[PDB]
Write a protein that holds these residues in place. Sequence first.
Motif, mmCIF file in Angstrom:
data_model
loop_
_atom_site.group_PDB
_atom_site.id
_atom_site.type_symbol
_atom_site.label_atom_id
_atom_site.label_comp_id
_atom_site.label_asym_id
_atom_site.label_seq_id
_atom_site.Cartn_x
_atom_site.Cartn_y
_atom_site.Cartn_z
ATOM 1 N N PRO A 149 36.573 41.492 32.561
ATOM 2 C CA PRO A 149 37.267 40.615 33.515
ATOM 3 C C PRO A 149 36.762 40.788 34.939
ATOM 4 N N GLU A 150 37.050 39.784 35.757
ATOM 5 C CA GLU A 150 36.630 39.803 37.149
ATOM 6 C C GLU A 150 37.750 40.336 38.040
ATOM 7 N N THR A 151 37.419 41.313 38.888
ATOM 8 C CA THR A 151 38.228 41.679 40.045
ATOM 9 C C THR A 151 37.590 41.074 41.286
ATOM 10 N N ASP B 49 29.623 44.331 33.912
ATOM 11 C CA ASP B 49 30.967 44.516 34.451
ATOM 12 C C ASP B 49 31.190 43.668 35.702
ATOM 13 N N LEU B 50 32.208 42.803 35.644
ATOM 14 C CA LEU B 50 32.688 42.043 36.795
ATOM 15 C C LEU B 50 33.872 42.734 37.474
ATOM 16 N N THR B 51 34.196 43.949 37.032
ATOM 17 C CA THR B 51 35.264 44.788 37.564
ATOM 18 C C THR B 51 34.671 45.917 38.408
ATOM 19 N N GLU C 214 34.452 44.824 47.192
ATOM 20 C CA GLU C 214 34.319 43.432 46.790
ATOM 21 C C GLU C 214 33.752 42.563 47.913
ATOM 22 N N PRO C 215 33.143 41.425 47.564
ATOM 23 C CA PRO C 215 32.698 40.482 48.600
ATOM 24 C C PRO C 215 33.871 39.985 49.434
ATOM 25 N N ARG C 216 33.591 39.714 50.714
ATOM 26 C CA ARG C 216 34.616 39.343 51.686
ATOM 27 C C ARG C 216 34.431 37.964 52.303
HETATM 28 MG MG LIG Z 1 34.118 40.731 42.208
#
Ligand SMILES: [Mg+2]
Lengths: 655, 655
Positions: free
Chosen positions: A556-558, A601-603, A610-612
């Motif tokens: 999953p993506e965070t 992994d997208l987590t 994480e990108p901002r």
């Molecule tokens: Mg992300």
Amino acid sequence: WAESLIGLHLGKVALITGGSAGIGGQIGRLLALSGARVMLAARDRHKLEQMQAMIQSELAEVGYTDVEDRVHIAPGCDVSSEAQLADLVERTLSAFGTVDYLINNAGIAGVEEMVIDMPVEGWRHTLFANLISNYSLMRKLAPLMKKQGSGYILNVSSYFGGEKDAAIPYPNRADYAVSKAGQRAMAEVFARFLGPEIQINAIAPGPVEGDRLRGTGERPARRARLILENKRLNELHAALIAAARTDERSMHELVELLLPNDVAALEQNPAAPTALRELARRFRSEGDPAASSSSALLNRSIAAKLLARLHNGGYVLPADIFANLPNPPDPFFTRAQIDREARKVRDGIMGMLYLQRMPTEFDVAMATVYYLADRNVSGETFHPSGGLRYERTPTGGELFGLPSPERLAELVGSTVYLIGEHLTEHLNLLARAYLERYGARQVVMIVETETGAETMRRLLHDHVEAGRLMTIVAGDQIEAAIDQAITRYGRPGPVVCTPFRPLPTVPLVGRKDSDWSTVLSEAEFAELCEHQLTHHFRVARKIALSDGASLALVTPETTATSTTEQFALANFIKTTLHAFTATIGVESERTAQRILINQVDLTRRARAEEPRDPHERQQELERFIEAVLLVTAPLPPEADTRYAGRIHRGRAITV
Amino acid sequence: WAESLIGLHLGKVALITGGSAGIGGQIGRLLALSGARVMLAARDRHKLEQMQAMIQSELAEVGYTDVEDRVHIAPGCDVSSEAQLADLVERTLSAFGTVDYLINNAGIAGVEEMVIDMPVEGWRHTLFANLISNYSLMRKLAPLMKKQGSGYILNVSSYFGGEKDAAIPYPNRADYAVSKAGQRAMAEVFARFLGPEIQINAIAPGPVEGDRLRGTGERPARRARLILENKRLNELHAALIAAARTDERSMHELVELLLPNDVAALEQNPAAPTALRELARRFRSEGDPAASSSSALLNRSIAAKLLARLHNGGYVLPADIFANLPNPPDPFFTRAQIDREARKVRDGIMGMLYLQRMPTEFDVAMATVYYLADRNVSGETFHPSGGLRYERTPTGGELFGLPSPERLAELVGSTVYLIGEHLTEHLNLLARAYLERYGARQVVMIVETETGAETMRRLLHDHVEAGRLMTIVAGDQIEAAIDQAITRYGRPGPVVCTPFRPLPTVPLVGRKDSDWSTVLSEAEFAELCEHQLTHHFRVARKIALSDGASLALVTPETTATSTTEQFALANFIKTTLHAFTATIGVESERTAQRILINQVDLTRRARAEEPRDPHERQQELERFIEAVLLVTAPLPPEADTRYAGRIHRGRAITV
Ligand SMILES: [Mg+2]
Ligand SMILES: NC(=O)c1ccc[n+]([C@@H]2O[C@H](COP(=O)([O-])OP(=O)(O)OC[C@H]3O[C@@H](n4cnc5c(N)ncnc54)[C@H](OP(=O)(O)O)[C@@H]3O)[C@@H](O)[C@H]2O)c1
Ligand SMILES: NC(=O)c1ccc[n+]([C@@H]2O[C@H](COP(=O)([O-])OP(=O)(O)OC[C@H]3O[C@@H](n4cnc5c(N)ncnc54)[C@H](OP(=O)(O)O)[C@@H]3O)[C@@H](O)[C@H]2O)c1
Ligand SMILES: [Mg+2]
């Protein structure tokens, strides 16, 4: 020897699952001697009554009174049954009131097969018994712990559940390994939510000396014969799959070459595919001349298991194709071959041990009972025994580039499968990369629902209109959907498997004085495992059986705005799936399967990574495409060396 | 509370360094209460006498007799002195005979500076006190342990020493972090050699509540003022380095802009470089108007530390350039600013703790003394306290590709430095890749000896004749050799740092009945640290100060035929250096230094992973070039986002 123990846990109440034998029985024994009142849960009433009587007798010897009130049992408790877990808690609270220590010790060995021989319902059973049960008992007992201001949850994991940033491959045990990893990951991610009142840790012993008729497999004749039979299965299956890839004959026609069941005849057949002739030469060379497996290819049990593999990969063969197979005379494998394999298994396990001695169940339980007195640890994995030589697979590399142009050239003209539903932007970008940048022939988009299908068809309308993008609706029948893709569009080269569902946004713990009614339920935790672990297992099992070239498992993506609970559940999934990826990677490598299986992994662990802004988000999505291409571009013929092949299987990289 | 303890270690002899206070004092106290005879070693006689008297009094209270024979002291023992370690062992064996438990507890905080402010001799001192001393006492005591058939070595490491497959960055503490990681790595790699007779493990507590005037820094006014002063240093230094890169003025002329010591005047100077004008705006905006640091750029102490940085990077400035600097009036930072930073540091540490409470020294020692009774663990790291939120850096990714063409374009016309001697094939291939494939202007080859220089000049004769390959002989003066390169050939873009020396091939343990005379000596272990750790630290310190664009730190090479001792020492180095790489990566990122520092590992964990034939060897060497380019190709201007910058610093990848 007990003087150090008496008094250490006086006044505590402990619940121990799997408490009638093994490590759990010794943990219950020593906790009782240390002064705790204990409830022992297991299936068989008789063993529980024997253990209860032994412990009570020992308590009376050292001076405790009214010992019947200090050791209770709960027979008929199968931890894979949610109803029986509810009854266990009701029985324990009725006897003792609030539980102080939850010792999640019960564990079953599981299916004990390679992933490609593993029934889906057997996998699920292992998850329910070994992992989902641990959440279920925590969910029932943590509210009372928090209300009273203290509690302890201990999950009995295994060395083979891995460690914080590395997976440990456990071939032929993927279900077990995943369950052990999940037990540790549960402690790692719930610790911040359960603190400060409640500690949660795992123990991960290595092999333990125990009853040789039971145990969960870590410790060391029939198993040796089964090893030899599954080696023959693997060699025949790999050669048939390979031959069918480059021969005009159907799988049916290729299996017909095996029906005389004659090794020398197959080797000498000038019209047989080279892969089968070379295999027969090896059977004759590497075989014991006194064993019928040196002159016969198969027996009826291997043949049935091979037929199941082929059917489960979508190959068309009559169910009675082996009905007239000549039966080879006993022994198929000689006593010498079997004893040699048995010594190999035993000496391998003993050779892991730096201290060259196997710990006892008593020793491990004693170390565990001392550890339980430590009030300053949570989210940790304690090794009460250890010192092991064994292969490990570091996870979480972030610094990577695109694959070589040689590997990218292998994608021209390929058939790509993409699996997903909610990650529509990722699916669109991937489909367009394979089709527009790397010359794939077509993409089959396998989604969960009609609504997901229409969303993707609209996003990809240009490729849909041109016949380059096909869509299939899988629902909860992903294997049947893959069979439709095989029949209609051809077998896959690269495959990318993303989850159908997003992560839930419910609380993971309740407020001290609440009823916890909105907290993630036992059923919702099981649903989480179904959608984020079992989903990938089913796809990996099916795609390997169907001769896919490569498979990327995507978590999953965070994002910078994911909830704190989503970060916790995502990292739980990421760690637990690493155990699957590492194990099936090594399984595939050791059995000469060509498929490359890896994890993307997208987590991430922390929100601050994480990108901002839109620029960083663009960078992230480009990294995702690069990562997926790095693991799915196939190795050209002059590249799949022993050395390179190990590098390109069983790895996980973080976008 | 002691009833669980008395008898647990009866009959054992224990040596505890740093045993007069802190965790070590409590370990000595509780081991004595558990029945061990203990020798406490430390520097100050008075504290040792107080601790000895306290322990002896407590022993008599619980019933021991002749307590003067159960607790001895060894004052004047500085563990950084090899001669004092030899005397300590002689004194302990004279008192008690053979030592059963070696508790390597002494640890100093170290230099407590960023790498680019860290004196080389201070780094070395931390290694001698915290790491080399641990090997030295093991080397002296393990022979007697093996001869008697049992022993225990416990290295007191730290959470901030990392874990098996992940580094934990500890900014401003690189020397300490490396020493803590080495203590753990020593246990990890020596366990197989020391078994079965001898266990070796580490403990890694998190922050511990202790005396606030001492400790090794993990637990929480003057330190807050120093934080603010070093922030001002970092911001000024980064802006000057950056300005000098793209301005025609010399560093001397740029520093002259600071000499009025007037923030507003610098911001308003239309001829000042944009980086300095924007910095001055930030000082005025982010500053407390009641603090003189909002209107003055520097004070004399910051100016001296800045001048040292510039001189140590080879920039030419007169030593008296700040002699007439106007002194800003007190307070340079306000009480409110200082208290705000102090609360920030404290709340940050406390916010790490899942259990929201600091463990005591007594608690940690109690958990440690229980752990010492466990006879089934070796090569492990036990966390007697834990449950910490903190950033970690996974190590050991193997699946990577080439860097982007955008980053490779940044190498055209660059000045490359290569450092090494014994890895001549790797150096030749790298020089040829940069010059022939990626358009570098020239390569400066920095070797250790004239013989190394001539070997490389012969291998690269074509580029030598064309003026593209220059060679410098560094000996043990790598900083002076880099200064020669700067003056004669220009400042470096990419830099690659390989070790001058190979790993030794001597035994790591002796036979039970031998004198151990051929086993790796205390001096040889120190030499190992000098050539394989301090080498990289000196280069990283110098190259960062000299405005290098990127730096790859390369570990020794293991092959399919390396000796088993070489594999052990190589993996010791690989794990320990990861702590350095991760820490300096984060240091550089957080202080706005542009340099990218990463690690490329030529060491693997297991012989079976190594190439076995010329084809696989060719694949390996191609992977090495790809790995080095992946970490040294600079980020183009439209790429060094916050997000991408963290990805490309502090990482380690395995060839
Ligand atoms: Mg992300
Ligand atoms: N054995 C090792 O070498 C080793 C090493 C590392 C980790 N571990 C972990 O240690 C734990 C215990 O292993 P072990 O070797 O002691 O196993 P074991 O010998 O099979 O444990 C037997 C105990 O578990 C109970 N049990 C078995 N299946 C159960 C079920 N479905 N529901 C409830 N109780 C059940 C048995 O009673 P009933 O049969 O009557 O139910 C008995 O009380 C497991 O979590 C395992 O993964 C073991
Ligand atoms: N403090 C923490 O929060 C924490 C957390 C994790 C790990 N650790 C590790 O725990 C160990 C002990 O830390 P601590 O907090 O107890 O430190 P500490 O308070 O500074 O330890 C004091 C003790 O060490 C002795 N000592 C100091 N420098 C010495 C030297 N050069 N040679 C010999 N003895 C010396 C002192 O006596 P003299 O001054 O008279 O020599 C005294 O016996 C270290 O290895 C540290 O890295 C500490
Ligand atoms: Mg090698």
